C-alpha cells in the first residue's frame, strides 16, 4: 500500500545507510571498520530489515538514497528484483518501485551519510564513488538468500559488479567483500551452469597485491563451494593446495571456509580434522546465513564420526531440537552400537537416496566396515575365548570363515590388540583393560593436556582483546 510503503522505506534506507557510510569514511581504522561491516551490516539487511513491516522490498527509495551510476540503466536492477521472471518469493511493492529510476522523492538531503548524487558523482579516483556503488549493489542482491530467485536482476549483476571494481583500494576491498559473496551465489547456490569463476579469481589477484584480508577470504570459500555443487570435485581438491586463508579473517568467513574444507578432507580419508572443522563453524558464526547450512552440517557430521571410530551417543540428537532432520541417521547409530552387520545394510540402502544430497554418498560404502570393526573390538575385549561359530552367528557374517579373515586384518591395523587362532577354533584376547601399565598413563595425560593448551591460549588472548581496542582508543 504505497501510502504506507513510504514511511517504511525512508526509515529503513536511512538506518542501514548511516551505519555503512559513517563507518567507511574514517579510512585508517581498518580492524573496526572490517568487523562492523562484514558481520553486522549484511546480517542487518537480511534478518531484521526485510521482515519488518508491510512489504519486504524497501529497495525503491534506497537506490536514490545513495548513487550507483548516474543514468537510470544501473538503477534498473532495483526494478528487476521487484518484478521480472519469477519476482522472487519476497513481498514486492505495488508501485513506486518504477522501471527505470525507482522513486521520485529523495531522502538524501545533502548528508555525508546519505550522500548527495552529483557530490558522489565527481569521485572516480576517490573511494567515495566505489563504496556507495557497492553498498547499493549489495543491498539489491541481499534478497537472494531469502528468496532463492533466479534470472531477474542477477543476469547483468555479475557484469555490473566487475565494472564497480577497478584496481580497488584496501578500504574498497573491505566494502566490496560483501558483494563478492553474492556474486558466486546467484548462479552457484541455484546451480545454473555458468562461469562465476572468472570474476572471483580476478578480484582475488587484485586484493592479494593490496593485501586486504577480507576480500581474499571471501573468494577462496566460494571457489571451493562452487565446484563441489557443480560435481566437478577434482577441481576443488587441487584448489586447496594452492589456497592460503588469512589468519586475520573474520568469524563468518572462517566458518564457511571450514565447513566447506571439512567435506573435502573427509573424502581423502581424513575424518579426524573433518569432524572438528564442521563443529566449530556453527559456534563461530551464528548468522542468518547459518540457518540454511546447519541441517547439512549435522547430517554429514554423523556419518563422518562413525568412520573416525567414535560411535556418538543419543543425547546429542536431542539437544539441537533438529532431532527429526537427524532422525534417519539416528537408526544408523543404534545399528553401530549393537555392532550387527545385517541391520546396517538394509537401513542404509532405503535411506541412502536422501544421503546423496549432503555429500555423504562417497563415504557411505566405508560406513559398512565400521559396524564390524565395533563388533570385533567388543568380542576381543569382553571375553578371552569364545568359539568362532558363536561370533559368526552374533554379528551376522556370511560365513564362520568370513569372521576369520576380517579378524585377521583388524589385528594388523592394531586397533583391536588380540590374536585369532584359526586352527584352534577361537579368538584369544591378548589385551587387558588398563591405562596404567606401560608408558601409557603419560599418553592419557598427553591427550587431556593437549586439548587444554588450545583452550588456554584462546581464553587469555580473548580477555585481552577488548582492552586492545581501548588501548588503541588511548586509555591506560
Amino acid at each position: 500500500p504505497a501510502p504506507q510503503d513510504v514511511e517504511m522505506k525512508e526509515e529503513a534506507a536511512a538506518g542501514s545507510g548511516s551505519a555503512g557510510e559513517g563507518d567507511g569514511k574514517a579510512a585508517a581504522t581498518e580492524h573496526s571498520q572490517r568487523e562492523l561491516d562484514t558481520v553486522t551490516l549484511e546480517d542487518i539487511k537480511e534478518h531484521v530489515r526485510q521482515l519488518e513491516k508491510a512489504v519486504s522490498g524497501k529497495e525503491p527509495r534506497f537506490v536514490l538514497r545513495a548513487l550507483r551510476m548516474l543514468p537510470s540503466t544501473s538503477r534498473r536492477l532495483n526494478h528487476y528484483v521487484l518484478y521480472k521472471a519469477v519476482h522472487g518469493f519476497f513481498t514486492s511493492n505495488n508501485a513506486t518501485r518504477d522501471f527505470l529510476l525507482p522513486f521520485l522523492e529523495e531522502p538524501m538531503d545533502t548528508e555525508a551519510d546519505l550522500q548527495f548524487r552529483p557530490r558522489t558523482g565527481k569521485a572516480a579516483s576517490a573511494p567515495l564513488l566505489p563504496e556507495v556503488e557497492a553498498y547499493l549493489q549489495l543491498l539489491m542482491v541481499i534478497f537472494l538468500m531469502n528468496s532463492k530467485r533466479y534470472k531477474e536482476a542477477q543476469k547483468i549483476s555479475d557484469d555490473l559488479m566487475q565494472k564497480i571494481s577497478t584496481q580497488n583500494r584496501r578500504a574498497l576491498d573491505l566494502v566490496a567483500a560483501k558483494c563478492y559473496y553474492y556474486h558466486a551465489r546467484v548462479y552457484e547456490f541455484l546451480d545454473k551452469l555458468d562461469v562465476v569463476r572468472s570474476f572471483l579469481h580476478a578480484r582475488l589477484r587484485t586484493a592479494t597485491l593490496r593485501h586486504d584480508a577480507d576480500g581474499q577470504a571471501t573468494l577462496l570459500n566460494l571457489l571451493l563451494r562452487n565446484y563441489l555443487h557443480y560435481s566437478l570435485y577434482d577441481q576443488a581438491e587441487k584448489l586447496v593446495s594452492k589456497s592460503v586463508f588469512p589468519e586475520q579473517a573474520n568469524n563468518n568467513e572462517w566458518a564457511r571456509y571450514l565447513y566447506y574444507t571439512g567435506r573435502i578432507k573427509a573424502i581423502q580419508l581424513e575424518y579426524s580434522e573433518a569432524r572438528r572443522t564442521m563443529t566449530n563453524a556453527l559456534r563461530k558464526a551464528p548468522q542468518h546465513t547459518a540457518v540454511g547450512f546447519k541441517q547439512t552440517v549435522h547430517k554429514l557430521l554423523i556419518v563422518v564420526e562413525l568412520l573416525l571410530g567414535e560411535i556418538p551417543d543419543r543425547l546429542q540428537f536431542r539437544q539441537p531440537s533438529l532431532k527429526r532432520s537427524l532422525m534417519p541417521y539416528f537408526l544408523l547409530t543404534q545399528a553401530v552400537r549393537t555392532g550387527n552387520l545385517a541391520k546396517f545394510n538394509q537401513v542404509l540402502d532405503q535411506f541412502g537416496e536422501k544421503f546423496q544430497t549432503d555429500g555423504t554418498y562417497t563415504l557411505i560404502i566405508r560406513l559398512r566396515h565400521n559396524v564390524i570393526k565395533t563388533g570385533v573390538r567388543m568380542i576381543s575385549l569382553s571375553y578371552s575365548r569364545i568359539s568362532l561359530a558363536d561370533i559368526a552367528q552374533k554379528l551376522q557374517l556370511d560365513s564362520p570363515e568370513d569372521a576369520e579373515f576380517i579378524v585377521a586384518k583388524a589385528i594388523r591395523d592394531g586397533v583391536i590388540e588380540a590374536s585369532i587362532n584359526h586352527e584352534k577354533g577361537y579368538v584369544q584376547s591378548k589385551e587387558m583393560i588398563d591405562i596404567y601399565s606401560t608408558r601409557e598413563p603419560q599418553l592419557a595425560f598427553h591427550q587431556r593436556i593437549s586439548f587444554c593448551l588450545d583452550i588456554h591460549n584462546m581464553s587469555v588472548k580473548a580477555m585481552r582483546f577488548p582492552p586492545k581496542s581501548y588501548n588503541k582508543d588511548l586509555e591506560s
Partner: protein, 32 residues
C-alpha cells in the same frame, strides 16, 4: 574471562569517546 568481559562492556562507552578528545586536547594545551 566472563567477569573480565562484564568490565569491558561498562568501559567501552568511555574508552570509545576518549579517542576524539585526545587530538583536540593537544591543540588546546598548546594554545593556552
Amino acid at each position: 574471562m566472563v567477569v573480565v568481559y562484564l568490565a569491558s562492556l561498562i568501559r567501552s562507552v568511555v574508552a570509545l569517546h576518549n579517542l576524539i578528545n585526545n587530538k583536540i586536547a593537544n591543540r588546546d594545551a598548546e594554545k593556552k
